[PDB]
């Protein structure tokens, strides 16, 4: 009996728990479940990836068609936080894949730091999203931009750093908490002008999705970046 089957998304997994599989076997990153399976001398251990702290992982049990995160993709994480979800992108993209884990805050950047002591394809970059220019020596060009910010600019920010280190034709992943963007207007006011935005900066939405029940009035939107010569 196949007890953990590969997902429709390559790196990801279901066990129904959705599951990456650990790029560091034996230990846990934020106190989550891990389950290894052995059979013979052959051995492979996945972690247990919770929706109701990722919106990642929400948006993948909510049917999103691509994300774009993929073994061996090149990933610039903006909003990394203390690694939760950036440790489930390190197990996807694998040794071959890279993510910068981008976050301002210096105690989350002691976090991201700590995780990334054992993932060698973490690179911690903690600095502020909105001036790419101090940073941008040590991104190399990107395959796919998350983010996760929660601000009001956010879609500039983002803009900003996929004019610097997205690759033409490559692909963004951004969650939209609603109320950090404009607490007074609706959820679809709100998604409907960070989308507008996006496609004014030559980031075009290919699909987009809420997250209930794990979240209240939070999209995920995923596209491509299309710009000029
Ligand atoms: N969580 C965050 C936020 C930002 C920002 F907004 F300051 F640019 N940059 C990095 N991490």
Same mark, same amino acid.
């Given at each position: 009996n196949?007890?953990?089957?590969?997902?429709?998304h390559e790196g990801v997994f279901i066990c129904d728990a959705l599951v990456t599989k650990n790029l560091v076997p034996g230990e846990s990153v934020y106190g989550e479940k891990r389950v290894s399976i052995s059979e013979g001398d052959d051995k492979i251990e996945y972690r247990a990836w919770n929706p109701f702290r990722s919106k990642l992982a929400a948006?993948?049990?909510?049917?999103?068609?691509?994300?774009?995160?993929?073994?061996?993709?090149?990933?610039?994480?903006?909003?990394? =936080? @203390?690694?939760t979800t950036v440790s489930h992108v390190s197990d996807i993209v694998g040794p071959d894949g890279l993510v910068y884990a981008v976050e301002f805050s210096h105690r989350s950047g002691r976090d991201l730091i700590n995780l990334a002591k054992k993932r060698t394809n973490i690179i911690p970059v903690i600095e502020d999203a909105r001036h790419p220019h101090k940073?941008?020596?040590?991104?190399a060009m990107v395959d796919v931009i998350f983010a996760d910010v929660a601000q009001p600019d956010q879609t500039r920010i983002?803009?900003?750093?996929?004019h610097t280190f997205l690759r033409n034709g490559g692909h963004f992943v951004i969650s939209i908490k609603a109320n950090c963007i404009d607490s007074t207007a609706?959820?679809?006011?709100?998604? =409907? @002008?960070?989308?507008?935005?996006?496609?004014?900066?030559?980031?075009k939405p290919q699909e987009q999705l809420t997250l209930e029940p794990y979240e209240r009035d939070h999209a995920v939107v995923v596209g491509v970046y299309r710009p000029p010569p």
């Open positions: 196949v007890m953990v089957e590969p997902h429709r948006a993948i049990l909510g049917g999103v068609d691509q994300i774009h995160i993929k073994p061996g993709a090149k990933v610039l994480y903006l909003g990394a =936080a @203390s690694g940073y941008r020596m040590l991104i983002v803009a900003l750093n996929a609706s959820a679809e006011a709100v998604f =409907a @002008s960070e989308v507008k935005k996006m496609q004014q900066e030559n980031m």
